[PDB]
């Protein structure tokens, strides 16, 4: 039953290889789970050092021939397009669920009943999911509670020293861009800037928009408070004919004749701009005037802007100009002849950070900016990649907190309670099936891998911390009140996840149970590995 150049695994041998290949990828992301996990370096062919704990980014930067990790890679891709986080946790749930089920395969349990026991446990998990969840109020005074949610996302992807730095940054980034109403939130409206100069501990949040190319003159003012921003589409720089040509004067009389042809369009626009400063903000103190000027600036206007102390800008990005219309409010002016003071916008303190290689400009302190900029600083390249991964994962984690009114406590509070509930639910109810309870127990025993993994990376005994939580849950079942118990990684004993402030998104955990169920089931449903097409 074979042809030349064929390799096929039949009977239960393919199930043994698929689980064994899954145990390898499991241990890779096992030590990467939680804030106490490990931070691994991945360099493929580019010499580019990158350190991140995100489960999806690992699989995209590594080529894996194992077919088991291919479907897992498709699972991590579906979680990012929906949940946006928790890719490492889902992989740890799929890996251990195959190990607990593989032990029952040798017992003779058919894999269809194993998959049927998962769907029954998944429907019962959704019932406990609605009972265990906590409804959070839509009020905007929850920023204090948002600080606890922000730390839960940050502590995982960093060394925990940067969490306190990014805690006010990430929290204020979401509330500033999100107006308070039903509405929705847009993460694209929050810009991200990257700089390799300053250390990562010095990073700060930018309320407004920042731009790259500024005007360079020695007399330009460093700080300008409450300045008016004006978008300028005309060219302030000398221009030449479409064909290469130049104006060479042999006398002072020919100098004024040849140079006037180039500055004729410049002076016509330049003299009308400085007249706007005479009509508006001429006398009035505590006001300013700023020019965007997407096009360049000639050295002649630099001396004119220096006499009036006008902040000069040239070579502006077109994408940032559309955001300046929202932040500042000024309309794009194509012709200065039609320029009016109604087109002028309003901005706050504008100060330019002076660095030899690059210069920055801050449009910040605006009345209605309706935009945000997260400035990421770091000394090395991998420090910028890790911080950028934590911000993008942090913004998307908090994004699901405002959209989804339900919140779940973390630190193993959801996993330990669900594993203990499903084990005691089928015993009291006895409404599933007689034989199926074997496969249902495999799912309940696979839910305790996460709390055992969090303490494994910290070096604590997973059997000791598990017995301490069960003793607290038994004390919680005796009392008629509601008390949630969770594992504390720092101290090593149990903790109240509501007081400690460790919280997990409801949508992330809702798709984690259903997602890990279908992916791990399809791997057990494969009897034979087919090699064909060649």
């Amino acid at each position: 039953l074979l042809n030349p150049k064929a390799e096929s695994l039949r009977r239960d041998a393919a199930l043994k290889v698929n689980v064994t290949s899954a145990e390898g990828l499991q241990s890779v992301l096992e030590t990467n789970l939680g804030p106490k996990g490990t931070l691994k370096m991945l360099v493929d062919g580019a010499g580019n050092i990158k350190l991140t704990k995100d489960g999806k980014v690992l699989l995209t930067e590594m080529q894996i021939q194992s077919p088991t990790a291919v479907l897992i890679a498709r699972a991590a891709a579906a979680q990012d397009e929906i949940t946006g986080d928790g890719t490492t946790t889902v992989v740890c749930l799929v890996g251990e669920l195959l190990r607990q089920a593989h032990r029952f395969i040798q017992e003779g349990v058919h894999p269809r009943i194993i998959t049927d026991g998962f769907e029954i446990a998944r429907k019962e998990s959704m019932k406990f999911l609605d009972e265990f969840k906590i409804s959070k109020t839509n009020l905007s005074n929850d920023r204090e509670f948002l600080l606890q949610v922000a730390r839960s996302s940050l502590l995982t992807k960093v060394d925990a020293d940067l969490t306190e730095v990014l805690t006010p940054i990430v929290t204020d980034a979401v509330l500033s861009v999100y107006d308070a109403q039903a509405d929705n939130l847009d993460l694209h409206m929050v810009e991200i800037m990257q700089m390799q100069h300053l250390s990562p501990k010095d990073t700060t949040f930018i309320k407004g928009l920042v731009l790259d190319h500024g005007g360079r003159h020695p007399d330009m003012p460093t700080r300008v408070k409450n300045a008016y921003v004006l978008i300028l589409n005309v060219s302030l720089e000398y221009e030449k004919t479409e064909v290469n040509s130049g104006f060479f004067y042999s006398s002072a009389d020919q100098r004024d004749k040849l140079a006037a042809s180039e500055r004729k369009f410049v002076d016509a626009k330049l003299k009308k701009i400085i007249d706007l400063k005479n009509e508006v903000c001429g006398m009035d103190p505590d006001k300013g005037f700023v020019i965007i000027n997407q096009k360049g600036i000639d050295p002649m206007s630099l001396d004119v802007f220096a006499k009036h102390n006008i902040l000069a800008l040239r070579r502006a990005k077109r994408r940032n100009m559309e955001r300046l219309q929202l932040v500042t409010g000024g309309e794009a002016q194509n012709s200065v002849e039609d320029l009016s003071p109604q087109i002028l916008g309003f901005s706050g303190l504008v100060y330019q950070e002076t660095i030899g290689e690059e210069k920055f400009t801050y449009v910040t302190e605006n009345t209605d900016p309706k935009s945000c900029t997260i400035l990421i600083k770091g000394s090395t390249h991998y420090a910028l990649a890790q911080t950028k991964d934590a911000v993008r994962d942090g913004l998307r984690a908090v994004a699901n907190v405002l959209k989804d009114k339900n919140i779940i406590p973390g630190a193993g509070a959801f996993y330990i309670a669900l594993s203990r509930y499903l084990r005691s639910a089928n015993m009291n109810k006895l409404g599933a099936k007689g034989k199926t309870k074997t496969g249902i127990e495999a799912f309940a025993e696979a839910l305790l891998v996460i709390p055992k993994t969090l303490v494994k990376n910290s070096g604590f005994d997973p059997l000791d911390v598990l017995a301490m939580v069960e003793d607290e849950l038994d004390d919680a079942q005796d009392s008629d009140e509601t008390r949630y118990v969770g594992v504390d990684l720092n101290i090593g004993d149990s903790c109240d996840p509501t007081i400690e402030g460790i919280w997990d998104s409801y949508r992330v955990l809702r798709n984690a149970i259903t997602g890990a169920t279908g992916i791990a089931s399809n791997l057990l449903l494969c009897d034979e590995l087919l090699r064909a097409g060649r």
Binding site: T38, K40, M41, I64, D159, S379, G459
Partner: protein, 543 residues
Amino acid sequence: QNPNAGLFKQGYNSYSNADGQIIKSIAAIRELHQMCLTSMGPCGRNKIIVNHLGKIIITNDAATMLRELDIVHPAVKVLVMATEQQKIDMGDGTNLVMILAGELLNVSEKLISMGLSAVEIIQGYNMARKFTLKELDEMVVGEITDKNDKNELLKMIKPVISSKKYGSEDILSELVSEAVSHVLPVAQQAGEIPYFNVDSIRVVKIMGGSLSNSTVIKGMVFNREPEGHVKSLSEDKKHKVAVFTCPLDIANTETKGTVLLHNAQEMLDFSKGEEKQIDAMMKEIADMGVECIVAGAGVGELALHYLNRYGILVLKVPSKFELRRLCRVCGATPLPRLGAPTPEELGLVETVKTMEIGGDRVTVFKQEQGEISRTSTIILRGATQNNLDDIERAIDDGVAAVKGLMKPSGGKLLPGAGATEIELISRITKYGERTPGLLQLAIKQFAVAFEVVPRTLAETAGLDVNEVLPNLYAAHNVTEPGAVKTDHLYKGVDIDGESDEGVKDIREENIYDMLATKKFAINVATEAATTVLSIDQIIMAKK
């Protein structure tokens, strides 16, 4: 027939913690750790490296050597990237960062084999780092007043030259400090506007002479020829200098403009045309008072003939980097055209002459009083080319040391020569018993990791480890009959070289370490070792 377990990916390289790769990664760093142990200290030496293009580079600096070495293991690249953090910002202390980060991994190896979790190892260093940062503020003995005096600069520059090139530190300190005082204006108690840059001091060298015969120039020094029959200008005050990007030749069209001769009639017109046009443009420049013309492009044959009759000095600087530092002195600006010496764009030089220094006649650029220069150049002389190139790299480290005098804790200093690293041991172990829990293992080993600095200086100096080391512990730890500790806090580590008993006091030779350099080096070395200890797995692929 023999399978392999643990690798599900591909035939590429997979490094996991199961076989102890965290020890092998340190062992690969340990191979390069002993390389830096032969660098830091006055007993160190430059390394000869031949480039793939057949070029020999010789320098004592280890950070520069890392750029000339091919790094294989990516775990070492993390330390190389962390080494550049020390070279770019403070410019000094690269040997302190790499050696300490390598020792932090050595003391952590004993904790890994003991069974201590790597997470609690990182948590211990993070708590010990905050304890060290608080002590560095109270360990400051003296403070630099930022007087910018020549005698005040000799105190900071002398230890910077030390542990690089020994025996010339007395001669080189007077050469470096003299150029620093030339580029610094007169100001006090003002930190708003920066003044001293890293490009303000240029280093030139010439064969012949010695270090004692070297001088210091207040401006840029050019080693080329004047390219004309005029050797130097006069001594008159405020000579005008014009920088021209356009080459010296008859005015042509920007597009094409190639001179061709169809007949002999055009030969006499174009030849005399180049003679009358160039002479007319050079006359208008000389009438405005410009005695020096800087030509960035090539110079024609007829141009040098008319500049000799008008007495105009010829200067050619094709490098655009030298033109930037030239604008900071006289104030000249490059003109896109030729024959239009606008007085607003012209510069002013006090004195420009061609003098013979080191056996060859060179045309220098300097000043006297007015038009104060922000750029200076040091002329080096010596009979040894190998030691001459090493001084060029040692001065660049001294230039960055002057930059560390700015607002971020520039005046505060700590005693050096192994006195700082040993004193941190008693202060950290004092906090070890104060902090309960499992952190005591990493906190105590964090202070033991500072013993590599005094041991390396004593080992490379030929001193017995069993002798000087127990005297170093008794120097910083004493029993005083009273509540207030007294007597000698100045006992450091001595290199000897002649003879001595025990150690010596730092107050004798005034060898101090800046607080901004030492405090920044500890944070970089801690975060560098934090990255390595946090990585338990490394995935690589074949090229």
